[PDB]
Amino acid sequence: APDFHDKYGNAVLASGATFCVAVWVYMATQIGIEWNPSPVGRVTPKEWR
Amino acid sequence: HETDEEFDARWVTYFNKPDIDAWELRKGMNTLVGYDLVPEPKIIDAALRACRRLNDFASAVRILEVVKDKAGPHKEIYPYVIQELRPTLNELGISTPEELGLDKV
Amino acid sequence: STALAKPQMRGLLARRLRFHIVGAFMVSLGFATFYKFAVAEKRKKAYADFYRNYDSMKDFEEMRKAGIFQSAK
Amino acid sequence: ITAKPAKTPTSPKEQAIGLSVTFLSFLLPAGWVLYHLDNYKKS
Amino acid sequence: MFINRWLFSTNHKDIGTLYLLFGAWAGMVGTALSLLIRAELGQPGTLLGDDQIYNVVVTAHAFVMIFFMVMPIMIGGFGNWLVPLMIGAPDMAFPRMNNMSFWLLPPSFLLLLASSMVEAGAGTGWTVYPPLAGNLAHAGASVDLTIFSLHLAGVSSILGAINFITTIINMKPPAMSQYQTPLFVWSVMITAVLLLLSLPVLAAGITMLLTDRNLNTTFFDPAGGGDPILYQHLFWFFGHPEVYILILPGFGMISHIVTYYSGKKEPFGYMGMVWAMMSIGFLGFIVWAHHMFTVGMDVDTRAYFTSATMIIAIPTGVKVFSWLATLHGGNIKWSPAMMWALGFIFLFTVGGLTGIVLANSSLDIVLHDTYYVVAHFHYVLSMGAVFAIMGGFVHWFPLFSGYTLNDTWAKIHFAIMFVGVNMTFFPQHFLGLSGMPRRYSDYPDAYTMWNTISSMGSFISLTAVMLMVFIIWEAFASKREVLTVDLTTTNLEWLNGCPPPYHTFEEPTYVNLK
Amino acid sequence: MAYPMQLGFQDATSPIMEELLHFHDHTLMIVFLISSLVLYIISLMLTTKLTHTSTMDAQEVETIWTILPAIILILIALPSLRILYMMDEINNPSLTVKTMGHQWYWSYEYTDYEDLSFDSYMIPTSELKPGELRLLEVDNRVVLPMEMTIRMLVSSEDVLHSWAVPSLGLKTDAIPGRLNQTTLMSSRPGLYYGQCSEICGSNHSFMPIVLELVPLKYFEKWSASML
Amino acid sequence: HQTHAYHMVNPSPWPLTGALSALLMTSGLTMWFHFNSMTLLMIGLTTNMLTMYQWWRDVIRESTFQGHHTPAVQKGLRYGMILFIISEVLFFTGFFWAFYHSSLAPTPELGGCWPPTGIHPLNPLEVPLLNTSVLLASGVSITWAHHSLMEGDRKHMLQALFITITLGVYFTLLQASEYYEAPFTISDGVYGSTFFVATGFHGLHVIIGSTFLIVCFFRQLKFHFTSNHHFGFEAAAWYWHFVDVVWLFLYVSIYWWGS
Amino acid sequence: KIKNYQTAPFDSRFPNQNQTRNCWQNYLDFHRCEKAMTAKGGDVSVCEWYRRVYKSLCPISWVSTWDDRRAEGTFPGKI
Amino acid sequence: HYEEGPGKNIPFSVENKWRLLAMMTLFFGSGFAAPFFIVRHQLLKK
Amino acid sequence: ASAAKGDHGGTGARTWRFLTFGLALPSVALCTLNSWLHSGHRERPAFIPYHHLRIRTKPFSWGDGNHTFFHNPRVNPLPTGYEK
Amino acid sequence: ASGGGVPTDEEQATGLEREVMLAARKGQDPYNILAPKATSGTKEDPNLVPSITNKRIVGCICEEDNSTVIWFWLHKGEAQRCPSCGTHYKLVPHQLAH
Amino acid sequence: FENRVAEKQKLFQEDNGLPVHLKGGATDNILYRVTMTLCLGGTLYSLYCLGWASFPHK
Amino acid sequence: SVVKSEDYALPSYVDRRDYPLPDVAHVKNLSASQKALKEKEKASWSSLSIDEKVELYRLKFKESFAEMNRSTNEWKTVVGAAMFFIGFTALLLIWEKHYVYGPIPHTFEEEWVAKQTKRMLDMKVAPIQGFSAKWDYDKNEWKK
Ligand code: HEA
Ligand SMILES: CCCCC/C=C\C/C=C/C/C=C/C/C=C\CCCC(=O)O[C@H](COC(=O)CCCCCCCCCCCCCCCCC)COP(=O)(O)OCCN
Ligand SMILES: CCCCCC/C=C\CCCCCCCCCC(=O)O[C@H](COC(=O)CCCCCCCCCCCCCCC)COP(=O)(O)OC[C@@H](O)CO
Ligand SMILES: CCCCCCCCCCO[C@@H]1O[C@H](CO)[C@@H](O[C@H]2O[C@H](CO)[C@@H](O)[C@H](O)[C@H]2O)[C@H](O)[C@H]1O
Ligand SMILES: CCCCCCCCCCO[C@@H]1O[C@H](CO)[C@@H](O[C@H]2O[C@H](CO)[C@@H](O)[C@H](O)[C@H]2O)[C@H](O)[C@H]1O
Ligand SMILES: C[C@H](CCC(=O)O)[C@H]1CC[C@H]2[C@@H]3[C@H](O)C[C@@H]4C[C@H](O)CC[C@]4(C)[C@H]3C[C@H](O)[C@]12C
Ligand code: CUA
Ligand SMILES: [Cu+2]
Ligand SMILES: [Mg+2]
Ligand code: NA
Ligand SMILES: [Zn+2]
């Protein structure tokens, strides 16, 4: 007889992957986290003195 | 210690013992499959004939499945062993696991 | 019909192990050739090249003019 | 190992309840403290 | 009946179960403290307060995880349950003194919780160095309550070590030599010798610290001719053997779990595994000043401690390669306990190799007191002691309880924890090479990215700890009762059924000499 | 100082620090290789249905397992101990500077000639000037002459601290009643930062070290102006 | 019914009362040092004494009165007592290490010398040598007690053990007098610290060993020992030799070499 | 000779990281010298070297504490 | 004697899974919550 | 190193009794005389308030906080000198 | 010099200690202090395993010096064989208070 | 004195199901209750003292 | 048939590819036709039908090798559920960021970072490899 994995395995894999990627991308990009990446190639240095 | 031939000969003799009992048949096959080899046809032949003296058809079939399993992904080994055993399979009326559908998952 | 040939039946796990422990070693030599060339040698060369004609007074004057120091304006 | 089938099967719904209550027993009390940290400090 | 059975116990299995419950509760306390550390550090700035409350939390995190989670679970919990069964003994040699080793732990833990409630806590580091821990910079009761907590944990484990040594030497079947005992039993015997010799020296040093703080002695105060560096020697003369005490019973469980799920009757190279654990226990007493390479010691002393510390890699490597050779040719069963043991082999090897980096005293000048050391020991502690504990807990839970876990959930639990702990600790190597100090509540802005990711990792391990509690609940809630277990001919602790009767081996095994 | 997303050591400011970087690269390669050799044997053990479960002889293979690790340890220890004794060699300083750790700041004393000493405290975040570094800048920097061997002597007047400057390869603990010595030589002018490296109470995170390395004549005039 | 020789002990409250005595003594010392109160501490000392008394009473009931100490049980208790003595040796080792660390490298605060400036050590040829003779003598008299007991001689066992305890008490009274007379105190820098804490823990162990010998004396009076079975006496004799050897190391190290 | 004094030279009596006894010995030597010199009527200027060396090596607070204790009659080293 | 067997060799009852859930929640939950309340306590004092 | 006595050829209590009364107790009686000759108050040294002695970093938990546990007025000065 | 007054074990040992001492005098080992010596272990000459019940655990150290012990229950009835080396064992049940 | 060990052996071996710490009779029950009451009461008192000492004092 | 907890000391049945001939038959009690089939098995096996041979095999053993060794879909559930709970973790972290953490320090403001970057380049932070090495001091721009 098919067990839990045969019947629901594909859906648990697809939905858990979709959910995980969506929520981490949102967390990483949309809520004001300051990752502080390298300025190299990114920041234009500005006069400080 | 010994040559491959001597190893094989001691196992053939083990299973060829006329009054081998059920416990010794099981001890022999469950010991033999712990080694790094698939048993030569002549060893399997003597184990299958021990199954016959012990009136145990099912264990003859299981021995054939364990040969296939001990070959791992070398899929050329089992068909060669069954080829070599066919005269004994026919003489004892042993069906292979495939002829019985017992290879289906 | 034709009979199947007899295949090797004995020492299959030992044979597979022999084959791969040697492949595992050959990476290690090949990776050791990388790593060393991509990181270690590259570092020795970045330090040697940097210091070869490095002028510490000129580096100091550039810093002093950029106003970084307490002791030197 | 082999084992008997469950004497008192815990259905998917009951597992969702046990899992929720277990997660909340850790998340709620710590979340209440962390939420009120500014209250504790600015006090 | 309840009080006679659970407060007055003289039974090694019930006392083992008490230790497992205590160590599990401590593990939730040490886990919360670890998440407060990572919440403080998970963005730049100050979350909680200054370094006092922060290092109270860091200090309690270490003491709880070491003394109240790992030691009680590995030695009190698995040692008591398994050792007498693996040698066919009817109980421990001193079954009533065994119950006092257990009961001294709730009061020890109470004292440590009292330390953190009174005054401003003991924000000293788990090493409790003076003068920061002395009565001028840590006035008031907190640090004395911490010392007393360690005295009580110390007596509990010294009496436990006497009990295990005596039991293992004296209560085997008369035909069984010490070279016919399982590796987990050897691991407990060696760990108990290390406890017996090292704890009294820590007890001497923290007693000296107690009298400097309350009797006007000056062991560690230069004003009286004392020396703060003497405390460090006495503490680390215990503290290095202590990390081998935390891992050895783990090595013993890993040997059994690898053997069993490789379908083998025995571990590869049994006498080399015994030799390796004895040599590691021995060498673990002559290396302690690798914790003191920046204190100003002489060059030749630093050369000797570098070399002796590295030498431990030789017997330790024998064990790693012997676990590989035990998997070799196995009929591999991918059970959740097997996954925990394979994770152990790989993560312990990573952290042992960063320990080798650090044994070089010249490089340790720059890595000492930075997060490179934090990364080294969390790879051997939360990805070695913790993984060996979770491997042995899922492996033997059906023996102790009579019920099975759901293996799918337990594999999911292993997968979440393996991701979380590597996300947490792997970036701390970068923080340490680039110079972030230990015991800091906040860091220069350049260290933001790796601290953020390390904190996100600690939350993933929090989700794993919550799920583990659900998994244990689900097993007791569903009551799937164990029927047969594989390989009892080489795993004697299963042969009396699951769970075994309260009294086992009332008639001893029969073992002939021949 | 460290920069964002940094993986490895700060760039070397001193020849000894340079030696440590090459020695770390030598060691880390070994590390790489052993960890990968293990991961790989391990996946090899776990990826076949072939079995061999009967007793295996351990003697021969245990020789490989002890000897090869012993040789790899000797290949690490030889250059490790060369560096250890090289840093210990006599080098004749031109200047001695003392630093005393305190809760929570460092003081500095340059008393070869005059009585010069001052305190050095972290710049509070709310007083940083634009472009200055949070938790790292100090009000009074440790000005020192570049390209000169300097003896630093380190102690404390209260609890333990530890005086560190990672780009020069330096970390010496500050212990009351003890005077520990280290030597410092910068190949370059500039500003080189470190942070207290032994837990010392409420503001352990907030008592940094800033060295300012400049030509001798500038160091002399700065010294005279600090009296 | 068992067919092994080992002892299944009856369920007992004493491990719990002893663990709680420990909590009460340590929280009591904390109260005493910081909150000016001796109450918790006296309750913990009382419950610790009550626990010791009833636990060891029960071990005498289990052995002398109920017969559970077969040879295999006794052999375990031998190992137990040896391992306990080893852990007490290591505890003293920490204080010897503290003594040699401070005395071999005397700091400037002491005058850069040992004994420090301003310290006037006791003369090791006066009461300290007398105490040495006293404890060595009591090692000879306990060995006499042991051989009389093995030879079945009740009266000479009791006479030799009484001598041994009288010498224990003599050393304890001599040491109490020397502590009072000593012109330096525990607060007199690392000299007074090492002196009083190392000799003070040793004096505590002399008091513990003497108590254990007095327990053996009253059990002997009650005929509990046979000429072949008397492990409590052997354990007390090994612990007593331990206290004598520790004294010898303290005498040579602190009183003699350190004077 | 040895004006052009820059700092205290390497001293093979104190070759290790712990230099406490180097400061202490020079402080002692200086004061012992100065007592010898201002006893026997002679010139303290002969003690100058010890004074330079201890000033270079010794923390100001140690010198200051030792000087207060010599004045109080509680300096525990022998001069 | 004492009860023997699955569910009977432990100091807590597993006779009812929901009463068990409550006890396990209180048991592990109180250990996990304690350090947050200690920190709250330390913040509130001063 | 034998020492100089000279026994064996049987064994036990009798010989250890002989050692107890013929050597051990005589040695104690002798040392008890030696001690009771050099006993009795030796004259106390000038008080000097050395900072490495009479340490007080925290008051003692008995008495007025300033007296050691087995304080002897005759020979133990306080941080401020000998009592009245 | 040399009264008695000290009881001997023969006079005063009691309980299990006494049972062990009285049995050892008879050359008997009801409490399993000594290791049993093996027979040749064939089916005609099996190792004989005493027991006070209907089954007892056997550990078989198959060859001298093996570190691996092989454990199994031995039940009343026909001889059984160690599952590693085949040597034979037979249970001989019953009664203790001799 | 006389050797009364045989009397104690008969007492402690009486088949009355008592655990050894109560088998000497009513005085064992009394000393047990005294010990346990001091331990548990002392332990409550120690918790009270923790509560008192956990807060700055008035 | 029916394995009881109270049988743990008895030899038992197991399907394992490394112990092909277990210690007992999977089924020992036989019906009338099963007893007749065991008698027939004592005669030539060529006279057994295929169904009779399969019925003897299934009396002796529970599962065949192909059955006991089959692969399963379990990995989907494990990987998927692990990703689920990892995804749930990010909820916790969103919650903490919204309700627990306050503003980070002003030194992360864009203009501050531009000025600090120039000042790091002016003091030649890590000029050999790590930071200023990556700046072109001639062209006044990041190296390509
Ligand atoms: C379980 C705990 C555990 C274990 C097992 C270890 C194992 C080791 N540790 Fe660690 N360690 C800690 C817990 C542990 N450690 C803790 C808690 C601290 C800091 C304490 C504090 O300050 O709070 C610490 C600190 C610490 C320091 C001090 C760093 C500093 O503070 O500056 C050092 C330095 O030598 C060190 C080294 C090592 C070494 C060489 C090993 C070795 O024993 C590892 C040997 C293992 C291997 C090497 C891997 C397997 C081998 C092979 C696969 C063979 C091939 C290998 C080679 C040829 C090298 N450790
Ligand atoms: C006469 C023979 C010796 C017996 C000693 C009698 C008194 C107390 C007994 C305990 C002895 C143990 C050592 C503890 C440390 C200090 C006591 C040292 C011995 C002693 O009694 O030292 C006295 C000081 O006592 C003081 O402070 C006394 C303070 C008393 C407080 C005890 C402190 C509690 C210690 C906690 C111990 C923790 C135990 C660890 C167990 C380890 C776990 C494995 C010396 O008197 P003084 O006036 O300074 O100088 C003499 C001047 N004429
Ligand atoms: C000043 C007060 C505060 C400090 C507390 C300590 C105070 C004093 C404690 C003194 C120790 C008394 C111990 C009495 C033990 C009596 C029980 C006993 O001796 O029991 C014996 C077994 O030995 C056994 O368990 C041996 C078990 C003995 C171990 C005890 C010895 C030391 C314990 C010391 C605690 C150390 C504290 C360390 C300080 C850091 C009984 O077997 P037998 O003698 O063979 O008799 C049977 C024959 O009759 C049959 O024919
Ligand atoms: C380190 C481990 C911790 C990980 C993170 C925990 C995740 C949080 C779980 C939720 O915790 C709850 O969150 C609510 C907010 O969502 C809080 O309500 C607070 O906020 C509500 C909305 O503002 C108000 O209605 C409530 O009265 C007020 O208590 C509540 O107290 C707290 O229990
Ligand atoms: C049934 C089992 C047994 C459990 C027994 C529980 C006993 C409870 C009694 C507590 O009351 C007392 O209160 C005293 C004072 O009111 C305190 O002493 C202290 O009290 C003050 C604190 O400094 C000072 O006035 C004193 O000098 C100092 O000794 C001290 O806490 C205690 O003696
Ligand atoms: C009364 C008693 C007789 C012993 C007995 O056989 O019951 C004797 C035998 C040995 C005696 C003891 C030992 O001779 C040693 C002690 C000597 C002292 O002079 C009196 C008390 C002393 C402690 C004695 C008291 C008592 O007279 C004892 C105990
Ligand atoms: Cu100063 Cu940390
Ligand atoms: Cu260490
Ligand atoms: Mg440090
Ligand atoms: Na922070
Ligand atoms: Zn066998």
Author numbering:
A (entry chain K): 6 to 54
B (entry chain E): 5 to 109
C (entry chain I): 1 to 73
D (entry chain M): 1 to 43
E (entry chain A): 1 to 514
F (entry chain B): 1 to 227
G (entry chain C): 3 to 261
H (entry chain H): 7 to 85
Quote the original article.
5 is the terminal oxidase of cellular respiration that reduces O2 to water, coupled with a proton-pumping process. The enzyme includes two redox-active metal sites as the low-potential sites (heme a (Fea) and CuA). These sites donate electrons to the O2 reduction site that comprises two high potential metal sites (heme a3 (Fea3) and CuB). The third proton-conducting pathway, the H-pathway, extends for proton pumping from the N-side surface to the P-side surface.
Complete saturation of the azide-binding metal sites is not attained by exposure of CcO to 20 mm azide for 2 days, whereas elongation of the exposure time up to 4 days does not significantly change the X-ray crystal structures. As typically shown in the results obtained by a 2-day exposure to 20 mm azide, the process of azide binding to the metal sites does not tightly synchronize with the progress of the structural changes in the heme a3 and helix X. The azide saturation period was found to be somewhat dependent on the CcO preparation batch. Some CcO batches provided the crystals, which require 2 days for saturation of the two terminal azide-binding sites.
